[PDB]
């Protein structure tokens, strides 16, 4: 019907991520936070290369980073966007967990 | 807990499309199919570039495309990955409308 419903419809990665619609889906089901990388899986798996035993690592450079972060009413969010490294768990050679931005 | 389910909650740009997250969400209600153009908002908006008054256009290049396919178990569904061109309805320099893949 208009432009905003067809990018919600019809268009995959806006790296201004949709918070409202993507955290009250059953994935994240209404949590306080999520981070969101945009990336390719590449370079993000390539963090832990070389990495078998659980561990949690800093990636040496900066990515774009999505925060959706809840409001006071439920299940509503307010989008942080920013470019910084982050802390994931590599565990046989791949990340596995979200640990932080900034430091681990 | 592992890296297939990393992805799914932190990568952005993985060009696979949770077709099983996504299709169960108020804007798909569950529906048999629908395709999702894999890029950033502008160049499809531009598609519509310099169109005031309803009008189905045919994209002059190729996209990445990815359709959401239900299977014979309601609200489980298959991925189809694709290049190719598709038919917005363009209404004051925007598309409103997805008309359909290949051809208007």
Redesign the interface.
């Known amino acids: 019907?208009?432009?905003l419903?067809?990018?919600?419809?019809?268009?995959?990665?806006?790296?201004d991520?949709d918070c409202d619609?993507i955290m009250?889906?059953?994935?994240?089901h209404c949590k306080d936070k999520?981070?969101?990388?945009?990336?390719?899986?590449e370079p993000?798996?390539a963090i832990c290369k070389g990495i078998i035993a659980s561990k949690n690592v800093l990636t040496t450079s900066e990515f774009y980073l999505?925060d959706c972060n809840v409001t006071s009413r439920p299940c509503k969010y307010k989008l942080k966007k920013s470019t910084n490294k982050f802390c994931?768990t590599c565990e046989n050679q791949?990340?596995?967990?979200?640990v932080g931005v900034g430091s681990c």
Chains 1, 2 share one sequence.
């Open positions: 019907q208009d432009w419903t067809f990018q919600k419809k019809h268009i995959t990665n806006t790296r991520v619609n009250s889906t059953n994935l994240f999520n981070t969101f990388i945009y990336s390719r899986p993000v798996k999505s994931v791949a990340p596995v967990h979200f």
